[model samples]
Target: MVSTLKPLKIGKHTIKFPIFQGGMGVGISWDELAGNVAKEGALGVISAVGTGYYKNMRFVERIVAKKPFEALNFYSKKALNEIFANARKICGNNPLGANILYAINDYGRVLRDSCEAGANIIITGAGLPTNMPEFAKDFSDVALIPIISSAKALKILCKRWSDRYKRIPDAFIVEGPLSGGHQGFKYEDCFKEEFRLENLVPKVVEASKEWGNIPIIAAGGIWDRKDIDTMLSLGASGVQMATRFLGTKECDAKVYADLLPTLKKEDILLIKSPVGYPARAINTGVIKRIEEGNAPKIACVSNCVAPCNRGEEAKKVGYCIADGLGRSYLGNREEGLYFTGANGYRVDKIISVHELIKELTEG
Candidate 1:
């Protein structure tokens, strides 16, 4: 009774399933999850946001106050290389992608690190990566995909890329406000009628056609087979899912597996992030503490994102994002940030990537 899901082609690589595991960070969706997703025929993406946390900070060189000291230590090139090498062990020759947020500090360095670490595709979001290709010029075979929220944003990015680098994005992921982590829309626009994923996809598809027919991947709140079908019907070449994969056995952030199932629709709140974007996460004690101005002391150990201004923004927001995320990864569920999709409550149980993929592709 399952319908056929076609393969997705991005530049020189071919993904057997039109499913991409949306990248998560701070020890989530690293080697194991990404590797297995790729092995099972989907495009598994490693998050390049906090590589220093990989393997209990084994690859990080400097540590200050129990966190990676700066951008260099935070986005450790050694850790990234190890993650890719470990992922390659599982997926073998299958293509693997890296999702590096453009908002992160040392964006260009991390982008180049990912390329050198054997990423077949580099996906960037959290900002319009107009100059994404500039960092990865040496790795011409690596496909570039930017996550955008609108047709106009896509147009601007395309124009910039084509004009400057004489290249354009290989694919565009049209993400709605319902996704986990950072959002592209203003907090008010996230609830607007026109910014929903379904409404946004067709417009991006139209724009992609204008730019030589690039592939469009729909993201945010993508839950199951029906959701995947809805995207494909509306003109998306594939779907990029993150929160759904949180319930998978191979996901690096297993702390959330138990947490997501107990949440409600309203429990998934859109909170302010130091990265100058609205982020979606579960309403935990961490957020309550921040709201009350009684949150933990602000320390800019990680020097994570550029928008945070070395913890200045974090101080105003009442939490260090790097610490919050890293704590969550370390299993401090009570006081750590818990990012998830709007439908995170629907994740009733943990499952294997193989079974999850079968359900989506088959049913």
Candidate 2:
């Protein structure tokens, strides 16, 4: 029980708890989860991916093959606004955030959409996001936080941001390989000793000192009160966790919240994502079919991510991310992709957001 954990300040906002509930996509960590997390005093981030699938594709303007037709519909601006509006109803004035992947097909548009949707902070990953500030120029108060894996990446981002935009990041989330969804490191590097979150945080903390000592938030595989203390002791200002929150009652993805309890360590592993990054997920029927070259046919209806090249990469990777994730969002386990951090298997039971945060802070 480390009550000494300090509040985290990002730009003009002060988070009562330094903990950040990492944004989950495909209907996970949406209004209910994010709203309650912010209300509970931590940063609650809503994933800005696959918003078209929100509420049974009600906001999408077009659909083909039961999927949002293009990137615009896939990342529905209308749905994003409604989700944020609903979240605001629960969190009130709390510092809520939106996570927009840099690899999405309409990255700039979605970034602007989140800003217009009342996101107080925008957290981006899946790429370096060198030109992130370019899109958020109108929303000056929306703090920008990029997720990076190494000190070199941080330095490069800072240099680019400073030279091009004359602005530095509000904060940096130093994520390790064990985070869910896509990873920053190559699949091989994820298993290396130096790539561990504990090792990466210290070096990143040292690098941040070069740029006025900006706050560092360590993410990936962080489990309990002891892990939080470890990151704090290593000079991190805060921590971001996703998987642990997947077991919470308010987490939008009931499919994952109900399934996480039955997972085994061997059941979760890294898989090749169409986004050209290694993603971690469960070894469900979809994975088995992929390995056997019998996974569902590739269809790029959503045109969700940029690197997928409109389903080319999905063909190579043997699955359509948009389709799989959207299926999972709709609770189709047999053919859906279920993403979770490496520690997902550790969840033994479902609990409320309040109780989970209480267990983390009060031990």
TM-score on alpha carbons, each prediction: 0.97, 0.97
lDDT of each residue in 190-285, candidate 1, tens digit only: 999889999999999988888888999999989988999999999999999998789889999878777876888888889888999999988885
> Where in model 2 is the C-alpha error above 4 Å?
291-294
lDDT of 2 by residue, 1-363 (tens): 455667789998999889999999889989999999998899999989999999889999999988998999999999999999999899998999999989864789999999999999999988989988999999889999999999999999999999999999999999998888888999999999989999999999999999999999999989998999999999999999998889898988788776888999999999898989899989996787777867887767899888888989898878898898888888887888888899988999898999888888873
Residue 90, model 2: lDDT of 96
Tell me the whole-model lDDT of each prediction, alpha carbons only. 0.89, 0.91
List the pairs of residues colliding in candidate 1.
none
Task: Candidate 2: count the clashes.
Answer: 0
| Candidate No. with top lDDT | 2
